[PDB]
Design a protein around this ligand. Sequence first.
Ligand SMILES: NC(=O)NCCC[C@H](N)C(=O)O
Length: 273
Amino acid sequence: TFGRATHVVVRALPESLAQQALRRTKGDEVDFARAERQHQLYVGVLGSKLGLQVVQLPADESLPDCVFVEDVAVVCEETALITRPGAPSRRKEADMMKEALEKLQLNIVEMKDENATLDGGDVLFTGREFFVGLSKRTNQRGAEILADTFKDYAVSTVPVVDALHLKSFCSMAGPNLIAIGSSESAQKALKIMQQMSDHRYDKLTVPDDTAANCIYLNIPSKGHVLLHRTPEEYPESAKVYEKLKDHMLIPVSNSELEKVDGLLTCSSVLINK
Ligand SMILES: NC(=O)NCCC[C@H](N)C(=O)O
């Protein structure tokens, strides 16, 4: 079942994130205490409200981006790909992720090739196939290693030109539903993804590209659940999500981590055991 999960890996925010995490925009400073509250609530939704078993990794102050666990592993069925992140300052985040995923009894494949890089944020898994963004973080060799790892799924690539990652402007919002931004760049990427597949996806188009990043889960006794950005943060995109009477909708605040380019998917790795 697409979107089913039983377990989630998350990682605590280091104090060094506020000043030292990588960020493309040098805008408003991070309110660290508020970022911590937003992470607490996020983890609480996944564990307490939705009932997932949470594995919470400790912060490492030497790894200011270590909260962004998505980028260090891609999990599909019983297999985990431990990535070689594109940013050198993030590579040692793989160490504790590999240990956590071993302890969850997944089959582990490590991206060792020193000519390969891949961030998990560049990977869109639809349930039927993978789309991998080629970005400043993820190269062709990384995409090839992903394809080799998940041999039972088609893997196609798409250029990421004007954002950090593919999932900076898209995500799955349901079993056949791709949430997508409205910018020229997001729409160009969507059209390439659609041209590379023989499967017809539905789309949930939102006016704020980064509000297209959402988390879909299929949870027993709750059904089709969608975590999406709040009306306070993106009022015009929240109006689109709010029309989805076919989902259980959970607004989740993320203002502070978006200052360092993290959206909703970035702070968890979901696992179905
Ligand atoms: N999947 C994601 O949303 N990753 C966000 C990573 C943000 C972090 N500051 C970075 O630059 O890698």
